Scaffold this motif. Structure first.
Motif, PDB file in Angstrom:
ATOM      1  N   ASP A   1       0.952  -1.199  -0.039  1.00 34.29           N
ATOM      2  CA  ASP A   1       0.102  -0.015  -0.014  1.00 34.29           C
ATOM      3  C   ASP A   1       0.950   1.235   0.055  1.00 34.29           C
ATOM      4  N   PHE A   2       2.159   1.428   0.527  1.00 40.97           N
ATOM      5  CA  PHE A   2       3.026   2.184   0.797  1.00 40.97           C
ATOM      6  C   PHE A   2       4.002   2.328  -0.380  1.00 40.97           C
ATOM      7  N   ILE A   3       4.076   1.685  -1.384  1.00 40.96           N
ATOM      8  CA  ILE A   3       4.875   1.612  -2.436  1.00 40.96           C
ATOM      9  C   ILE A   3       4.758   2.991  -3.248  1.00 40.96           C
ATOM     10  N   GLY A   4       5.835   3.681  -3.397  1.00 46.71           N
ATOM     11  CA  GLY A   4       5.629   4.907  -4.228  1.00 46.71           C
ATOM     12  C   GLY A   4       4.946   5.901  -3.484  1.00 46.71           C
ATOM     13  N   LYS A   5       4.818   5.711  -2.514  1.00 46.57           N
ATOM     14  CA  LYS A   5       3.954   6.893  -1.372  1.00 46.57           C
ATOM     15  C   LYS A   5       4.723   7.231  -0.105  1.00 46.57           C
ATOM     16  N   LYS A   6       5.091   6.253   0.597  1.00 50.12           N
ATOM     17  CA  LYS A   6       5.815   6.480   2.047  1.00 50.12           C
ATOM     18  C   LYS A   6       7.077   5.398   2.114  1.00 50.12           C
ATOM     19  N   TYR A   7       7.936   5.729   3.087  1.00 45.10           N
ATOM     20  CA  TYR A   7       8.936   4.929   3.754  1.00 45.10           C
ATOM     21  C   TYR A   7       8.328   4.128   4.650  1.00 45.10           C
ATOM     22  N   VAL A   8       8.649   3.134   5.134  1.00 47.91           N
ATOM     23  CA  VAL A   8       8.098   2.215   6.146  1.00 47.91           C
ATOM     24  C   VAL A   8       9.035   2.019   7.020  1.00 47.91           C
ATOM     25  N   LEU A   9       8.778   2.311   8.594  1.00 46.23           N
ATOM     26  CA  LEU A   9       9.434   2.025   9.671  1.00 46.23           C
ATOM     27  C   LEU A   9       8.646   0.828  10.170  1.00 46.23           C
ATOM     28  N   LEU A  10       8.860  -0.197  10.182  1.00 44.98           N
ATOM     29  CA  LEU A  10       8.120  -1.479  10.657  1.00 44.98           C
ATOM     30  C   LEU A  10       8.715  -1.896  11.773  1.00 44.98           C
ATOM     31  N   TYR A  11       8.342  -2.061  12.846  1.00 44.12           N
ATOM     32  CA  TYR A  11       8.884  -2.498  14.213  1.00 44.12           C
ATOM     33  C   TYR A  11       8.011  -3.379  14.856  1.00 44.12           C
ATOM     34  N   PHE A  12       8.797  -4.414  15.480  1.00 43.58           N
ATOM     35  CA  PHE A  12       8.136  -5.463  16.064  1.00 43.58           C
ATOM     36  C   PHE A  12       8.666  -5.421  17.777  1.00 43.58           C
ATOM     37  N   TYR A  13       7.614  -6.022  18.561  1.00 43.70           N
ATOM     38  CA  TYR A  13       7.442  -6.034  20.086  1.00 43.70           C
ATOM     39  C   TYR A  13       6.996  -7.376  20.274  1.00 43.70           C
ATOM     40  N   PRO A  14       7.285  -7.909  21.412  1.00 43.42           N
ATOM     41  CA  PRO A  14       6.892  -9.431  21.780  1.00 43.42           C
ATOM     42  C   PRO A  14       5.339  -9.643  22.132  1.00 43.42           C
ATOM     43  N   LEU A  15       4.879  -8.589  23.206  1.00 44.91           N
ATOM     44  CA  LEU A  15       3.402  -8.835  23.558  1.00 44.91           C
ATOM     45  C   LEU A  15       2.650  -7.638  24.046  1.00 44.91           C
ATOM     46  N   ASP A  16       1.475  -7.174  24.112  1.00 43.79           N
ATOM     47  CA  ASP A  16       0.719  -6.172  24.754  1.00 43.79           C
ATOM     48  C   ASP A  16       0.577  -6.743  26.138  1.00 43.79           C
ATOM     49  N   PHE A  17       0.240  -5.907  26.747  1.00 48.35           N
ATOM     50  CA  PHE A  17      -0.201  -6.039  28.162  1.00 48.35           C
ATOM     51  C   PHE A  17       0.673  -6.545  29.348  1.00 48.35           C
ATOM     52  N   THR A  18       2.011  -6.625  28.959  1.00 45.60           N
ATOM     53  CA  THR A  18       2.985  -7.299  29.742  1.00 45.60           C
ATOM     54  C   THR A  18       3.393  -6.322  30.957  1.00 45.60           C
ATOM     55  N   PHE A  19       4.434  -6.463  31.855  1.00 49.96           N
ATOM     56  CA  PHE A  19       4.725  -5.856  32.844  1.00 49.96           C
ATOM     57  C   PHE A  19       6.200  -4.988  32.595  1.00 49.96           C
ATOM     58  N   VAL A  20       6.454  -5.145  31.430  1.00 54.00           N
ATOM     59  CA  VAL A  20       7.647  -4.410  30.793  1.00 54.00           C
ATOM     60  C   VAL A  20       7.271  -3.371  30.111  1.00 54.00           C
ATOM     61  N   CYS A  21       7.571  -1.869  30.424  1.00 54.47           N
ATOM     62  CA  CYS A  21       6.994  -0.840  29.927  1.00 54.47           C
ATOM     63  C   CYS A  21       7.313  -0.764  28.141  1.00 54.47           C
ATOM     64  N   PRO A  22       6.330  -0.125  27.531  1.00 50.81           N
ATOM     65  CA  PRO A  22       6.338  -0.448  26.184  1.00 50.81           C
ATOM     66  C   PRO A  22       7.292   0.964  25.651  1.00 50.81           C
ATOM     67  N   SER A  23       8.415   0.896  26.079  1.00 55.30           N
ATOM     68  CA  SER A  23       9.220   2.146  25.732  1.00 55.30           C
ATOM     69  C   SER A  23       9.465   2.439  24.181  1.00 55.30           C
ATOM     70  N   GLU A  24       9.357   1.436  23.340  1.00 55.97           N
ATOM     71  CA  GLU A  24       9.463   1.631  21.811  1.00 55.97           C
ATOM     72  C   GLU A  24       8.264   2.217  21.416  1.00 55.97           C
ATOM     73  N   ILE A  25       7.028   1.591  21.568  1.00 53.55           N
ATOM     74  CA  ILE A  25       5.780   2.211  21.053  1.00 53.55           C
ATOM     75  C   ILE A  25       5.602   3.551  21.383  1.00 53.55           C
ATOM     76  N   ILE A  26       5.948   3.787  22.828  1.00 57.70           N
ATOM     77  CA  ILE A  26       5.846   5.401  23.148  1.00 57.70           C
ATOM     78  C   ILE A  26       6.861   6.371  22.761  1.00 57.70           C
ATOM     79  N   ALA A  27       7.934   6.096  22.773  1.00 53.85           N
ATOM     80  CA  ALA A  27       8.996   6.832  22.290  1.00 53.85           C
ATOM     81  C   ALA A  27       8.813   7.094  20.627  1.00 53.85           C
ATOM     82  N   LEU A  28       8.427   6.209  20.078  1.00 56.67           N
ATOM     83  CA  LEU A  28       8.183   6.234  18.479  1.00 56.67           C
ATOM     84  C   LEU A  28       6.805   7.129  18.386  1.00 56.67           C
ATOM     85  N   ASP A  29       5.795   6.797  18.928  1.00 58.61           N
ATOM     86  CA  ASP A  29       4.606   7.765  18.753  1.00 58.61           C
ATOM     87  C   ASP A  29       4.853   9.162  19.459  1.00 58.61           C
TER      88      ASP A  29
END
Lengths: 173, 173, 173, 173, 173, 173, 173, 173
Positions: free
Chosen positions: H27-55
């Motif tokens: 969908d992003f071809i010829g429109k946007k560069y994509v920064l695809l990132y992975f993280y293990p799980l939602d709702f864990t007790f490890v703070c979501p430092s990457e989702i929050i910093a990126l947002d």
């Protein structure tokens, strides 16, 4: 297996008439619910409590539009000879529901009820008018005594198709 | 599958306490009968009629020495958050039976209930004190409405273990 | 197959006595020659011309130290019921030679006589006191009528073991 | 193998004429019965008792419309040289039936008579006018001495095709 | 193949004596260089120009400590009969070098000279005292005419082992 | 391999000109004989005795209509730099025959001369105008010293194509 | 790959000294961080912008305890000749960091940078003191221009190991 | 993988809107560069430092025409519930970039970031407007702290596409 259609089959069979024919599971689509049951062998010294209990309750299956199909790895010729043997001599007598023959053992195998590539394990498989599996009863639930339970599951199935599931009162999307 | 032991598992779990732990199916051998049930996902907009109906009838399972185990492909962390969401906001509330987590999807796969390598199909699996499958209920028999039927099968199972099958009167070896 | 030992087997069997037992092909090593024969099914409407002709000539096999073994894919229980059915009602009557049971179809398969993973084809297999195949008779030579021919081959076998082959007069190394 | 057509072949051959040609098993369909026989090797110090005995009885095979085909893993050139060697010098002399050549060992292999991927084991294979195997004689029945027995089996085959099997008198469907 | 040892073999053989024995390629290690040659068949109508030319030059191979080994897919018995056939009748006569027998075709196959799983292609393989391949001559270089060339390669091999390769004058590391 | 066409290739190459191009073995069909040779690596401290000896005898190959092709696993760029390095500095100088590049190692592999999936072993492969292998020289025959021997084999090849093989005088079909 | 240890290797190498040796990736464990980089070929007409830019910034890598390793599918001998070729003649000159040789192409393959089983694609791989991959830079980020970026990632890596990640202020378990 | 197009996907997604949809990488071809990132799980007790910093740095990605895509093995329903959970209760709050759902784990698997067939490992994948991977950041470089570094790599990528690589001054073909 439990996702869409129950394993299909085209088998030889001894009807209530004691006449031979062919039975396909698809013959019953949009016509009848099917109660397919497996047992190991004809002519053994273990009483055939499941064939007899089911046949004794045949009218209860007919009133609920259910076709009873008994299946073992024996030939149609053996099935016929066991019906021509009275109960007093170790036979099943003239039962009025169909006995299918799984001579190649492929039916038992497709339902995952084939024991040591030899005989089928005891199993009760309820199939709906669309050919979809609704239950599999095995081991201590695959006994002649289970007839009352099978019929209650048929009544629940038929009731569930008519009215669907119920939602908890206080639950909201 | 239906010949000897039900597929074994060692899974992460959220207990009635909302505390985490590990659950192995073998933990219940010689202790409890197990009613293992599958559902697709937590947090959906389809009401969780089976978790709620089963939990509402928890005391009926305890009186019959049955351990209720709910299973989906969600993590234990998601299970906990869904329990901390009240029914009025689309959650399950503080249910008192265990929710196991099938994060690798291996449990669903071993019970042949994994749909398109994604989510588990609805299924009710009754396992005896020796770890042997007694029934598998699926499709229109795997509804919240089925609770009354599950308990009748448990009563039949427990009655069958105590007294065995019955022989037709006039049958002789 | 034809190089060393005939395919080995351990099967269930109905003896002349109508008592059940186990038969291994190796039981006859250094004791008897074996005439193992296959037929498709018990209880059919095709007369059992080979079982009956062979049993009628049983004393001719005993005088030549040959153990007759009849084999089909039917169970030992079916074999027994077919023996308890008289010839006038489509049975084999009380034959005095052993009927082995190839319930898993593995024997038929090892002798390459299994037809469409279902029934054995008609075959006469002569095995010596060392467990080595001497002949395989099939199709239009695997008939009840063939008894006279089988016995002549046994006499030739027994004569060949005693005296060996003969050399052409004028031939020299 | 014993179900329908005997393994087909297209081989090089030395005819009675000492001229070379090609022989296909299908050439004899609807024309002749075939007695295909195997032997290990040409030119050995073991007398060729089977080639010689069969050729000495050639007229008995011709009167019964049987084509004799001798087969070994040797080339057609070796076959010809062995025919040009007289019996007194260890040869077979000018035999009047065909010797086929199984240079690739594929024929022996298809009849399951190839010993240690080297030479064919002794075997007598009778094939009917439709190309169907009627017998396989091996070991102590695959000797030169067996000629009288082979001809009796041909007479039984020919008699069985004409009249079919016989039913036991007192047997009824 | 060309990296370390030439494919090993243990074969049946007809010696110069016309006596039979076994030959292993390893028998010649640290004793002789081996000129292993292949030809398709004994007894054909194509003159054996390579066996005869090589045997005519036997003393030239002996003076250079080379063991000549002729190989075809024929048996040792066929080899012996071809030696007992004089040249005037299409034979090879009493050649004084060894003919090995590749009855299983495994030797030809290991040297990649087996044509359509039937006969060996013409090939000249020179093997050193350590069992290492030095050359393979094929097609228009695998002719009887090639003897002079084979001996020149043996002289070059023997000269190369003694003195090693030569470096270009003006070349420096 | 030695049956029909030599393994085909399409490779990058440095010509006598020091210009780059592509060379296919099929380019020489019906035009030239090909002397394809392999060596392990460019720029080593082992003198390139085979490239230099062959190039020093280039006119002898041209007079015999032979195209010399040198091959190693190095790139065409490395080949060019080694030609631009004089002999006094460890290079090959401006050789006038083609050096092909086997960067993917597929050529070496197809000729069975690839050592430990890294470098080609020394080999001399003579290919005729139809693209058929006539010889493979390896180990102590794949030396720079071998040039005189290669040319004698080319003369024998060319002589054999013109006149064919010779028959022993006293031999008759 | 990115889970635990980076693919291990034991390769031939040309050191800053122009002396040869062996380099294993494990040699740097608990000693240095490794910046392993790939490039396609030595001696091409595409300027070696990455080798030169990295070597020009060698002291910046040494101050940060980083071992620079350049890798291509060329031999150590080719690497040495390219270093002995000055920049003005298309060479790399006497670079002071190590060039490893991936002659078997196994290193490129293990890092998934091997293009059409021939040459390595441009890649920058940063490996920590425990042998774990921290980044892979490719395509438009695998340019000589990227040096400033590589060093900033090394500074971030080294800073992250010392202080760990930071938590959002208002987030709570 | 790093040769041409990044592994393609068609996934379920929770947009900034909290509305559901489907997202394909194409969908992003010829429109946007994509920064695809992975993280293990939602709702864990490890703070979501990457989702929050990126947002928190979303506007910096938008100014550089980069589409941020967060990915874990959780369902879209779990993603939505985690967004409806505030940061103070262990949630991510209403982030304004898309969270894709890898319920079948196929995306993680295609990017080689799937840990023990369960959860994705932390990874930052930068993809250009043509769908080609430019970097993969993992382990101690796949932290929330890395945002400043990701943006510098985007600036380098964008600068490299505009101006290309630079050649060393004194280098010549």
């Amino acid at each position: 297996y439990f996702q869409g259609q129950a394993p299909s089959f085209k088998a030889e069979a001894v009807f209530g008439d004691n006449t031979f024919g062919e039975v396909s599971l698809s013959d019953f689509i949009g016509k009848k619910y099917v109660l397919l049951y497996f047992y190991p062998l004809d002519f053994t010294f273990v009483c055939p409590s499941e064939i007899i209990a089911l046949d004794k309750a045949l009218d209860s299956f007919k009133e609920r539009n259910v076709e009873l199909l008994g299946c073992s790895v024996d030939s149609k010729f053996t099935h016929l000879a066991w019906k021509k043997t009275p109960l007093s001599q170790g036979g099943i007598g003239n039962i009025k529901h169909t006995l299918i023959s799984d001579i190649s053992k492929s039916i038992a195998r497709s339902y995952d009820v084939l024991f040591n590539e030899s005989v089928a394990l005891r199993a009760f498989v309820l199939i709906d008018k669309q050919g979809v599996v609704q239950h599999l009863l095995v081991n201590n639930l695959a006994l002649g005594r289970s007839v009352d339970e099978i019929l209650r599951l048929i009544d629940a199935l038929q009731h569930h198709e008519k009215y669907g599931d119920v939602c908890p009162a206080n639950w909201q999307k």
